[PDB]
Write a protein that binds this ligand. Structure first.
Ligand SMILES: O[C@@H]1[C@@H](O)[C@@H](O)OC[C@H]1O
Ligand SMILES: O[C@@H]1[C@@H](O)[C@H](O)OC[C@H]1O
Ligand SMILES: [Ca+2]
Length: 223
């Protein structure tokens, strides 16, 4: 997160860290045994880390649970990042409380102008590199589809939306990938891609979760 603020320990209780020896992506807890992330975060040997603030210090509210199964969307295209979403089943159910909790799936798509909360452990600079150890937060509006398509001609599909600031300075970034975009208490987006971080007229692009609710519910009911 570039241009954000320090969330505060366990104030974003659905935020997960995906770990393969080191943090490499975020994700979102959607019930006690399933996590949603970006398909471009896929790899084998994932441990899901719940209840994290400082990802380098054991502070006492962590649950570390191995993944048992990963399901990349059947139509994921790694060249265009269309359908950039995947599901991860935990080997055991997480213990849910006020500091570890699930986030609700949406019943409708959010409109341009809605304010959302984006969070993660990714890079905090737009020219340079500095990875924080504690979770960072950003409040950002969903942008109109015409501004989104004009920022990224020929690249935005119906499964994507833009959120952020056209003036730059505030954005998600590398290492935030897979993490949540939450708007009015519902998971509306997944940190997916962008050109650089926090560049003028290059807002962040997010997977539009509302298009995937039927696939998620069906997949979970059968696996
Ligand atoms: O983001 C672009 C993607 O949509 C595709 O076209 O490959 C080239 C990239 O620049
Ligand atoms: O859901 C809320 C979101 O819409 C807002 O942007 O940040 C605070 C959250 O509670
Ligand atoms: Ca920790």
């Amino acid at each position: 997160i570039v241009g954000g603020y320090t969330c505060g320990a366990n104030t974003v209780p659905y935020q997960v860290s995906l770990n393969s020896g080191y943090h490499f992506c975020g994700g979102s807890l959607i019930n006690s045994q399933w996590v949603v992330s970006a398909a471009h975060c896929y790899k084998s040997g994932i441990q899901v880390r719940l209840g994290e603030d400082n990802i380098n210090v054991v502070e006492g509210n962590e649950q570390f649970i191995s993944a048992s199964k990963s399901i990349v969307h059947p139509s994921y295209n790694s060249n265009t990042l269309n359908n950039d979403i995947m599901l991860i089943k935990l080997k055991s159910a997480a213990s849910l409380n006020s500091r570890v909790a699930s986030i609700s799936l949406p019943t409708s798509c959010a409109s341009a102008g809605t304010q959302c909360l984006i969070s993660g452990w990714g890079n905090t600079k737009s020219s340079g590199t500095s990875y924080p150890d504690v979770l960072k937060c950003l409040k950002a509006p969903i942008l109109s589809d015409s501004s989104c398509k004009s920022a990224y001609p020929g690249q935005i599909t119906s499964n994507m939306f833009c959120a952020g600031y056209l003036e730059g300075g505030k954005d998600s970034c590398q290492g935030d990938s897979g993490g949540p975009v939450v708007c009015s208490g519902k998971l509306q987006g997944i940190v997916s891609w962008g050109s650089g971080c926090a560049q003028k007229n290059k807002p962040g692009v997010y997977t539009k979760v509302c298009n995937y609710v039927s696939w998620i519910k069906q997949t979970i009911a059968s696996n």
